[PDB]
Amino acid sequence: ANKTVVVTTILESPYVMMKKNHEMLEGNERYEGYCVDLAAEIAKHCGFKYKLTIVGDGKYGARDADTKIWNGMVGELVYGKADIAIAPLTITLVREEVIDFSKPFMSLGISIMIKKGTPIESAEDLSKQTEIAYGTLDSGSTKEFFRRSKIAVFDKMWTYMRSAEPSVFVRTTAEGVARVRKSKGKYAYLLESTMNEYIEQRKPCDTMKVGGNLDSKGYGIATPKGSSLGTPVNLAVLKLSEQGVLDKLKNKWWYDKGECGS
Template identity: 90%
Template sequence: VLFLVSRFSPYEWHTEEFEDGRDQPPSDQTNEFGIFNSLWFSLGAFMQQGCDISPRSLSGRIVGGVWWFFTLIIISSYTANLAAFLTVERMVSPIESAEDLAKQTEIAYGTLEAGSTKEFFRRSKIAVFEKMWTYMKSAEPSVFVRTTEEGMIRVRKSKGKYAYLLESTMNEYIEQRKPCDTMKVGGNLDSKGYGIATPKGSALRGPVNLAVLKLSEQGVLDKLKSKWWYDKGECGSKDSGSKDKTSALSLSNVAGVFYILIGGLGLAMLVALIEFCYKSRSET
């Protein structure tokens, strides 16, 4: 844009003076902002090093000023985001898996008093889960809770000394709710699905199965989960591990400065057209 504006605006063209004081003929006017000098000016501004040439016309100066403002905001935003990334205090978890829980004794862990999670551990034949079940059923005081709300209160009051084991769907939902002081640790222990109960032999079974399958294939269920779990979440992040990360600088965060840049370039081209018309009219 700077190259085009400089070529179009008559105020960017000038005659050079010889060493003996003579001027160049008007037909030999020069323009400092060729394609390479325009790129050099842009690079110098972006690297905040400046350049030995500068625009003469108003339109060229508008381009230069808008570009300087754009580079200032972009570089400042990047620097601030990088500094936050390097200095953020990360939340470090002493446990990362069920194996870590089973190997230690400092952190207590339990489940809902009556629920699928407790039944999973009670019936499991996997050595790690059997060991965890043996601990849970013999622990004193009891590590089982009557409600999920009670379990979350116990987690918060324990100051890192109690882990509550529950279904991943509920875990992810709670994690996105205030006071935003809990996090999901490790992967899922098992894979199960939710179902819709109907009376035995009900004619609804087939249509309901097909409808749910269709919603799943179309991605509607994932969209609904994203909407109610994360988009309407109160902790501002979808990534369950994002508590120990800074948010990335996205395009939406700096969209305003791009609008200013585009608007400024458009204004500069309009001013260059006005300069050209004014100069042409004054010479006739």
């Protein structure tokens, strides 16, 4: 018999956040956000009951080089702790080797966030100077993009980033944004275009996404290999795409209540 599906997700705005009064609420109603709405829609279309759970270690999915153990949401799928991950989980080769990804439900690319007024318009711009420091998260797909790259500009940027003092890496999105804002234009934060756009729409409206994206990829819903859930989840993403629901949800959580005008 079918079971209540365990959905692993993560606290990251505007994808998932706890409602302000979550202590007096229970279960799935404790949370709100893009991925909460998406989870609800996927569950509706696939006809399953589910329980939203926040990933234990608060990570996305990387494999320890020594222990070979997978962490984060990917880890929870791999080790049978959860049935599906619904989050801004970037589709990458190393992850798709061990879990199944649906077709992407949101597009994004690595992008540059600057404090307004920063004389930077592209990654090449960053790569040609040191006055304005720049960095990525200390773990995740962006950092890996830089570590792995064979492209000259990106390789130059990685070389700079790994040796820059003090460390140009940050541990959370909030930290990157905060560093940008506090640095009077002396720090630029490399982050997924989706988060960049989100933050750009929030007071005090002092950040800006600049330039084209450095790459082009997507977020996908993840399930363990051979899961019975994989096919219907994928078909559900397809259907929600074609009926305009994904566009509607992104507008809902990104732009509808934007605080920085039009």
